Paper text:
We validated the use of self-assembled recombinant NC1 domains to reflect natural structures by generating the same α121NC1 hexamer as previously isolated from BMs from a 2:1 mixture of pure α1NC1 and α2NC1 chains. The recombinant α121NC1 hexamer was composed of two identical protomers formed by two α1NC1 domains and one α2NC1 domain. Each individual chain (designated α1NC1α121 and α2NC1α121) had an identical fold and relations to its natural counterpart. Therefore, the covalent modifications and/or cross-links found in natural α121NC1 hexamers or potential directive roles of the collagenous domains or other macromolecular components do not seem to be essential for the correct self-assembly of α121NC1. In fact, we show here that 2:1 mixtures of α1NC1 and α2NC1 chains spontaneously generate the natural α121NC1 heterohexamer.
Basement membranes are extracellular structures of epithelia and endothelia that have collagen IV scaffolds of triple α-chain helical protomers that associate end-to-end, forming networks. At the C-termini, interactions occur between the trimeric NC1 domains of two protomers, forming a hexamer of these domains reinforced by sulfilimine cross-links. Recent studies in one of our laboratories revealed that the NC1 domains function as recognition modules, directing the selection and assembly of α-chains into protomers and networks.
Residue numbers in the entry:
A (entry chain F): 5 to 227
B (entry chain E): 4 to 226
C (entry chain D): 4 to 228
D (entry chain C): 5 to 228
E (entry chain A): 3 to 228
F (entry chain B): 3 to 229
The structure:
């Protein structure tokens, strides 16, 4: 009973790739931050797909048997949509958060699923005897508040985001506010030419329109 | 067959493998190591969380100068805790035994997953899956400093049968003593009263006895 | 039904896929990356610890203002290393001199599930009933280099089992194109635990050249029949 | 002109010593926490005496010419009072009796803190006069690994009243303050030996048997 | 004169003049903080340690126990107070002699008596304590975090908590590689303006664009006795 | 004499002599920084707080909200400036009274005037400012990191940034268990020698082996104002 988790990066429920039956839908969870420590859910795994959304989907308990819910300064992070940031750059609150949160689908697969990386602008071909589920971009890691964050296993479908976003995730707080922040970095595999592997990498600052020219491509395959 | 099911009893007695499943080994429930004030975690659902031989210091480190130190610095280990009452002083040598949770690795016919409700009610296994145990949604933990780690929500490790405010113990490797310290936090998923979306989470504090109803429930299911 | 196993040679040569498995692709052994002073690790047992193309900077970072920087800050990459010694001057290694330092890996398709068992002794652990051996090694658990940042291995993953024990099993590479070994680069191994000394207070031990493997736990990677 | 800084550890402001003119009173600021990175003020220096209290007394800016105030998840830490530990986080006005008050005075000479590392109170060095007697306050941690410490020469390492929880956490956005279970206070110990201790023996102390293990101090001023 | 020292930062390429009542010791470049082995250590801007006579993108080296000292040989940082110089129209890192117009200049001055900074916590100027004369006015600069959220800060009694000119990005990030640049995570924290009546009220979230930045920034004054 | 203090560190087992013009208050042991609950907190070497009258591997305790205080019961560190005493040939933890010969001694001296440090950023000794007399010379000491890359540093204006004798490993790591040892991750950071010519260019990456160490370490001098 193999599983494949797919993220739409939009407000709509993503359809299961050709060959896989649907189990349940939910909201795309990237990572949580509790007591200033980041803990993540791998996007390729079903743990990145919570059935219910909350800016604070967790509480903490101590040795004195005292639990606190949304009482301190903790974070939750979800994959974001193409929904534009309000022009005032103000914290998004209440039910205005729904259009910002990505949706996901946990699908039952007849066989094992994997992701391949090219380290090139060209799409990496699937291994011999493996059929393609989807293509995308190489999503390695991310850091937001206190430069804390998590990443993805490069063999997992979670390292393969179907749609490239310069801001792929939104920061939500237990105070009930969500917003993009300047320190929210996203890390993607670089395009490396085979002839330049063991040469000094040439520094490149990429403007809008050139962003994906140095971003590696990926394909999620199933046997 | 071929899958590895891991059971954590949360008691000083080893848990039994379900019918048809042959036991590989029983050990001690390892949560995470802490070397150089950096926490590396073992997923409670994976067979790595079940270490056969217990020690306050079960690891050593080496530097590039061809020198290895064992129990020579201030490193730590963390193990899943039993129901045993909280000691007044740090427990020593033989008196540590009833505090350390036991585990079992069972050989399984199919991959076992954990599903979460984020609700008061027990989540049901999807079509074609049978339930193994009912527990509580165990997300993450922090103890000494900022260090800790967490559990994958798809992994059966995120589903502990018994809810406990402090489900793990700190074992100081060099001194050979273990103890519950006040900076231990256990993070659990919450109950959301709505269908799928929670707007602004209301702040609350929960004393002993009123806790379990706000903790999310889970089931571990096998194909 | 599509199981994967990743082997690391710990040398400049490609490792051969263990008995029963078929080769998919070769590459370079990636341990962990460090971007914005934070470390993210690829488990050595998974295919993600094996990239087809090496770079001292194999990643870039993007911000909310739709700007992406490649090798334009101070970021790191960490790769499994070879028996190749450190130079006389102990200066940073750059250019095609890095090639003999980087380990090679192989991603292999397995017919059955792969796992690692640990003896916690100097003895080699036997494979469980119904399982067959692939390779033996030493119990590799975790590592820290710069800023005490790093990552670790799942103990039931083939990544926790390095075939050859190395005091310095990894090399530190920077976006400047320089790779070097550093004093703070630690490698954590499972120690040997005796049945008697389980709940006893551990005896402090300091091992030198030729005594390093005396307290290192042994492992075997097994695949079910 | 040296500046003396007193912390009353009560909701009332402390009096400046006779002859020394009070510049201002305020609230005893321990440290800010921006971006989960703690920035501390030394309790012996006037910077710890912030004239106006707020759960969020700071803002932040980025190179995009944009500034945020109480918009993210930042913190502030303030020295605490004897006030009963609240069962639930205090809010708006009920915060008042929890925050310690301070005073910055104009001293004719430099004040220093001397530590005994012993049960007995240290006597001031020759040519120095006593100002107050306290306990040796070293460092603190609260949220994550974050916190900070006091300087042992600085009068701020000498708190008149010992408390295992000498500080409170004020959540800037929510506007609430509360004591949490991970708040540690660090104090210098009593060493029974003359000047050197070899192998320390681990000890756990319940309420009542604590203070006899805390190092004692005196804040002294040079005579002129 | 008993040896009291005050450090002024011009936040431009020109040397700052020693404030009235003080005499000049030496000039240099405004060092905010260094970062080695991914840990930040800073120098208080009011102290002379924030004023180094010589600039380098790597002004330090480290040594290990095996008697080996490495200079500009790992991935380390140095941070300097920055000029009004606009960021290049490519956001690409600044190398070589092109860095000079970006680095602030400083002056270490000897004061006859103690130097201190007062804070108003309003848009108004805080008055000097009775018997203290003014040296300069500015804005309340508390702390900063750049790479890996690591950074340092200023003591509020120290003159270094009082930058004469408010900057959104008061500091530039320099690397051992010999590259300096501004980054999106380089935050600068300033004391907020609060009203006496608002003190214990729940703070109102505010977002400030270009033209509204100094609206909620507290003011400060650096004073000197006699 | 308004109450000015100068702290001198011998970096030996001997008590350092107060520089010319200053009177001795007390002697002690050179404390660099402590590390409690994984956070490092440092005492500036130029201040009297870096000079503690009594030594311990664990000179502090901690207390929780439950009014329970733990002493030397967890995994915490203390760090002390060290002597030129050689590390044992076995390289094993040093315990008990065997620690004494490794711990540097300090002296807190009452000064008539304010004390500062000047840094040249060259191999040459920077002269004292106009109207300032020289107390001692040394090497520019900026920061340090040991366990978990946590540590602290010095203020460059303070005399504590001016260590008299250059050491590749200037400090030792002590644990609350009662053991002290040098470790491979213990780095010391010093100001580098910069030239006015290559002030605004690419810094040349250099690795220095034994004997070449002090060739790039900046020089400093601690000065005190004339009365
Ligand atoms: Cl919260
Ligand atoms: Cl240890
Ligand atoms: Cl505790
Ligand atoms: Cl880089
Ligand atoms: Cl090194
Ligand atoms: Cl805030
Ligand atoms: Cl709590
Ligand atoms: Cl460098
Ligand atoms: Cl940026
Ligand atoms: Cl301890
Ligand atoms: Cl070591």
């Amino acid at each position: 009973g193999f599983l494949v988790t797919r993220h739409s990066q939009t407000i709509d429920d993503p359809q299961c790739p050709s060959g896989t039956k649907i189990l349940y839908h939910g909201y795309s969870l990237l990572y949580v931050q509790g007591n200033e420590r980041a803990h993540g859910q791998d996007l390729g795994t079903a743990g990145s797909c919570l059935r219910k959304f909350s800016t604070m989907p967790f509480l903490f308990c101590n040795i004195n048997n005292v639990c606190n819910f949304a009482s301190r300064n903790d974070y939750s992070y979800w994959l974001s949509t193409p929904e534009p940031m309000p022009m005032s750059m103000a914290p998004i609150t209440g039910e205005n958060i729904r259009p910002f949160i990505s949706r996901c689908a946990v699908c039952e697969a007849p066989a094992m699923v994997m992701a391949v990386h090219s380290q090139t602008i060209q799409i990496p071909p699937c291994p011999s005897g493996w059929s393609s589920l989807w293509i995308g971009y190489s999503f390695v890691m991310h850091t937001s508040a206190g430069a804390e964050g998590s990443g993805q296993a490069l063999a997992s479908p979670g390292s393969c985001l179907e749609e490239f976003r310069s801001a792929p995730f939104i920061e939500c707080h237990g105070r009930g506010t969500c917003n993009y922040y300047a320190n929210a970095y996203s890390f993607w595999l670089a395009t490396i030419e085979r002839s330049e592997m063991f040469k000094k990498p040439t520094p490149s600052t990429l403007k809008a329109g050139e962003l994906r020219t140095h971003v590696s491509r990926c394909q999620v395959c199933m046997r | 067959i071929g899958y590895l099911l891991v059971k954590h009893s949360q008691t000083d007695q080893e848990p039994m493998c379900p019918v048809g499943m042959n036991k590989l080994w029983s050990g001690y429930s390892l949560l995470y190591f802490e070397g150089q004030e950096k926490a590396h975690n073992q997923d409670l659902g994976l067979a790595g969380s079940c270490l056969a031989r217990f020690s306050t210091m079960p690891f050593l480190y080496c530097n590039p100068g061809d020198v290895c130190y064992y129990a020579s610095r201030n490193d730590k280990s963390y193990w899943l805790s039993t129901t045993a009452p909280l000691p007044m002083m740090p427990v020593a040598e033989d008196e540590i035994k009833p505090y350390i949770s036991r585990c079992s690795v069972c050989e399984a016919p199919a991959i076992a997953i954990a599903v979460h409700s984020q609700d008061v009610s027990i989540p049901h296994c999807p079509a074609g899956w049978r339930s193994l145990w009912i527990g509580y949604s165990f997300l993450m933990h922090t103890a000494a400093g900022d260090e800790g780690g967490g559990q994958s929500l798809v992994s059966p490790g995120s589903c502990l049968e018994d809810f406990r405010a402090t489900p793990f113990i700190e074992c100081n490797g060099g001194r050979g003593t273990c103890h519950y310290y006040a900076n231990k936090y256990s993070f659990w998923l919450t109950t959301i009263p709505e269908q799928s979306f929670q707007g602004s989470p209301s702040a609350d504090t929960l004393k002993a006895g009123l806790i379990r109803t706000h903790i999310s429930r889970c089931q571990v299911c096998m194909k």
